[PDB]
Amino acid sequence: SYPPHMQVLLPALSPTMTMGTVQRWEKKVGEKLSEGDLLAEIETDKATIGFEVQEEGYLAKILVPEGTRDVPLGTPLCIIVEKEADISAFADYTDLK
Amino acid sequence: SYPPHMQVLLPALSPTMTMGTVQRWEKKVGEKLSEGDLLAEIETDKATIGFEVQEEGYLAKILVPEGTRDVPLGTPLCIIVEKEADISAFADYTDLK
Amino acid sequence: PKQIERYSRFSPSPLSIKQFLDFGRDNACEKTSYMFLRKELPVRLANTMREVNLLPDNLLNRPSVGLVQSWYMQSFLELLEYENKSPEDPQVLDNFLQVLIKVRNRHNDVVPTMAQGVIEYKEKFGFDPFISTNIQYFLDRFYTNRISFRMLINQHTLLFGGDTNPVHPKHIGSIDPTCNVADVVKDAYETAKMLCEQYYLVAPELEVEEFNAKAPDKPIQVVYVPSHLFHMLFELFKNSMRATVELYEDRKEGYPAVKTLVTLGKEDLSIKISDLGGGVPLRKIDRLFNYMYSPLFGYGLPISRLYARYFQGDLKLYSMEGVGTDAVIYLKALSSESFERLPVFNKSAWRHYKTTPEADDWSNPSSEPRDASK
Amino acid sequence: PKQIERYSRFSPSPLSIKQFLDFGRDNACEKTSYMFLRKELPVRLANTMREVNLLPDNLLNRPSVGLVQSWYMQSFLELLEYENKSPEDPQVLDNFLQVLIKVRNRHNDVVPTMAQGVIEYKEKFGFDPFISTNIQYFLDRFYTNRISFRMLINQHTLLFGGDTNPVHPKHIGSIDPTCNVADVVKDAYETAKMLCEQYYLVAPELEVEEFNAKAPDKPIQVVYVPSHLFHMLFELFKNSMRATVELYEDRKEGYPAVKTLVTLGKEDLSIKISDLGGGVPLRKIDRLFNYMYSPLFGYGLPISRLYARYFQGDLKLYSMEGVGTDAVIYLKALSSESFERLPVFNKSAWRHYKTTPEADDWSNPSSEPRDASK
Ligand SMILES: [K+]
Ligand SMILES: [K+]
């Protein structure tokens, strides 16, 4: 359909956070993603937070661009793919066991 | 025979080095060995040199103990094994493709 | 520890002196404070606890470390009880206040209990290279978070504890909006002087100069927490008095004063304490802040520097071996720039605990270098 | 680059001032020196080259970087020709000497050519966070190795170049065994003064105090390379004179002196240059040594500090915003403790070039923190 892929959702990064600004991407489309790499800076009212890659892969696409303010919780932010072959398939915008 | 295994030989770590003192092991028997980890301090007449793991594995046995002075080039120093199952087999002292 | 994992994954909310002040002066709404603190304190404890579990097992094992850990666990669980207790009931407000007191008390001995821990560990497993810098990293973070819990609790209890006749009524919680620096300097000095005189039967005189570039004649004032500043000054004076008195106790010279310059610029409030106590070679300086190289618990200099860095300040030493030493406290001049600096547990932090020793970056000589004459 | 891989895997041999001195005074055997240098120089160049290939491609691409690189390659290959040319032929000895001269010359412009490189790169790709500290790491290492090539070559050419009538005949190569510090201080001052007077039409006076704790009345002397020390002092005096003169050019006050204390202890020789040029806020200090935040090429402070750290010394600044700044050079008191500090290429080094940005360890506030009054 599309190749096997993960959607990165904006968590509440602090107990009272209901939205945040995506202040900066720290990864490029195409780039490998190791668990714990820095992914983006999220800015709230309370803090500027280094958001970390939770699962390893390759950045397939950025669904929310730098600067977008007030992004709500749950908003998908980007797509992660298991293999770099599959990044191409996504410039067009569950075998993932 | 013995399980598949690598022998770590003392290189010339500097162009004029003909021997060195094994001043300190920085790894324990049993410990995982990643390429580039620090393995031992080798002391010469010229310098104290951090000797690095060149190949990944598990430390199987230490053939030369801390403090041994004037160890010549080529002297085997320790044994490295691919899998941790095989460390046991070596407390007794080419499918390695 | 599922609740601990989750809370350890939360990011701290650093507050500024401005915010504390603006909150206490203009607002002072208990609901807001409780709602903030019921979440923030567990966040902070969980971030620290996660790091304490990353210590080497040989240190983790020490009964003192275990005791600290269960104290934190016990505080975390007590705080977690408020997550779903509504502020609209003023009853809940009151009990929460009691719980804060309860945990401030429980945490009274944390600093030296931890200290006991690492001493236990050193005098039983020895002083090593990489592990030391690891414990260093940990203690800075742990003691800073601890200073910050205490700050937050003190603000709440002082503001809502309902103290009928409060010691410092112009203060806003623990914050003095017109803290007069020279006064704290003099006070810290007098109290070091008393301890120094008690033991050495003599003590140097204090001399204090000010330069307010902001407005030259006018006494220098800062928005700050006086007892933090007190603490820092006291430790430096104690060192300067001991160095001076030790150097001149066998000399005919007469004791040099311990001098203080206080300056205020567009952004720094600086306090330089100078003595002629003979100085310290450079190589021994960095170790003065290393907890486990440490008459009159030697954690005084490292902790003091933690107080300074806690609101974006700093504390630095510079000596001239053979003559004397300067110690400088830097504070932010503006409350609006004095944010809490808090240890955040994340992968970056995790990496420090999992760092395996690596080859030195830079050369190291042989300990018997070739004799170039022969 | 197979020969470069191999030599980059070799470890540098750091030498001490004692060794240089003992070699030139007592021994002075050309064979020994050639045998040492024919191996050591390629080792050093290969260690550096390997790191230059790890730069970001956007910097690697700059023609200036490429030029530096081919200069090194060209030197490495020329040196490698001696690996199997015997010292017993004195002919070989002579040509090697010529080759050293040839590469000192070729390397004459390395510092500013590299500087051009990173400027090209910044003004064309912008100033970023992690990359900056990366270039910082690289330049410290690169400029230090460069200082060290020059040191080694100068020792050999001065000792064996057969100079009929040498400028400083009591010196041993470039090392002065009785370098009188105040003299270098005065000289460095006079030459800053001249440039300062040229442009500002005025300059502060120098004042110099000494304290020799070793032996109190006796002029302070060190075994050292005078022109390194000169270089350091000159840069600090230039800054202190410019700060002072700029601050008082609109004042009725009369210009404060620039003061120097020189002290000598059991292990440190310390030189503190003090001015009342108004100081610098703390936040701007660390950047004074960051190459790419940089009237009268601003690499002067970072390079000077590289000279100090090169023989296990250091160079530090401490200011009081609103008043003035102290700069201190620390040198080892003992030649026996003054080892070269050399950048070693290994996995540790490699790791610095491959560091991907990571979350901050410590908290960072929002740039619009919640208004606590509302
Ligand atoms: K966290
Ligand atoms: K190397």
Curated annotation (Swiss-Prot), chains A, B:
Signal peptide from the UniProt entry: none
All copies of domain Lipoyl-binding, residue ranges: 5-81
N6-lipoyllysine, modified sites: K46
Compartments (UniProt record): Mitochondrion matrix
Superkingdom: Eukaryota
Coiled coil: none
Disease implication from the record: Primary biliary cirrhosis is a chronic, progressive cholestatic liver disease characterized by the presence of antimitochondrial autoantibodies in patients' serum. It manifests with inflammatory obliteration of intra-hepatic bile duct, leading to liver cell damage and cirrhosis. Patients with primary biliary cirrhosis show autoantibodies against the E2 component of pyruvate dehydrogenase complex.
Protein's job: As part of the pyruvate dehydrogenase complex, catalyzes the transfers of an acetyl group to a lipoic acid moiety. The pyruvate dehydrogenase complex, catalyzes the overall conversion of pyruvate to acetyl-CoA and CO(2), and thereby links cytoplasmic glycolysis and the mitochondrial tricarboxylic acid (TCA) cycle.
Family: Belongs to the 2-oxoacid dehydrogenase family.
Oligomeric form and interacting partners: Part of the pyruvate dehydrogenase complex (PDHc) that is a multi-enzyme complex composed of multiple copies of three enzymes, pyruvate dehydrogenase (subunits PDH1A and PDHB, E1 component), dihydrolipoamide acetyltransferase (DLAT, E2 component), and dihydrolipoamide dehydrogenase (DLD, E3 component) to which is added an additional protein the E3-binding protein (PDHX, E3BP). In terms of structural architecture, the E2 and E3BP components assemble into a 60meric central core with icosahedral symmetry. The central core is decorated with E1 and E3 proteins.
Record-given protein name: Dihydrolipoyllysine-residue acetyltransferase component of pyruvate dehydrogenase complex, mitochondrial
Annotated source species: Homo sapiens (Human)
Higher taxonomy: Eukaryota, Metazoa, Chordata, Craniata, Vertebrata
Gene that produces this protein: DLAT
Segment of the intact protein contained: 214 to 315 of 647
From Swiss-Prot, chains C, D:
Effect in UniProt of substituting D109N: No effect on kinase activity
Name of the protein in its database record: [Pyruvate dehydrogenase (acetyl-transferring)] kinase isozyme 3, mitochondrial
InterPro entries: AK/P_DHK_N_sf (IPR036784), BCDHK/PDK_N (IPR018955), BCKD/PDK (IPR039028), HATPase_C_sf (IPR036890), His_kinase_dom (IPR005467)
N6-succinyllysine modified-residue sites: K266
Entry's disease: Charcot-Marie-Tooth disease, X-linked dominant, 6: A form of Charcot-Marie-Tooth disease, a disorder of the peripheral nervous system, characterized by progressive weakness and atrophy, initially of the peroneal muscles and later of the distal muscles of the arms.
GO CC annotations, alphabetized: mitochondrial matrix; mitochondrion; nucleolus
Entry's family note: Belongs to the PDK/BCKDK protein kinase family.
A Pfam family this chain is assigned to: HATPase_c
Signal peptide per UniProt: none
GO molecular function: ATP binding; protein kinase activity; protein serine/threonine kinase activity; pyruvate dehydrogenase (acetyl-transferring) kinase activity
Induction: Up-regulated in response to hypoxia. Up-regulated in response to fatty acids. Up-regulated by PPARD.
UniProt cross-references to CDD domains, sorted A to Z: HATPase_PDK-like
Assembly, per entry: Homodimer. Interacts with the pyruvate dehydrogenase complex subunit DLAT, and is part of the multimeric pyruvate dehydrogenase complex that contains multiple copies of pyruvate dehydrogenase (E1), dihydrolipoamide acetyltransferase (DLAT, E2) and lipoamide dehydrogenase (DLD, E3).
EC nos: 2.7.11.2
Annotated localization: Mitochondrion matrix
PROSITE patterns hit by this protein: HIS_KIN (PS50109)
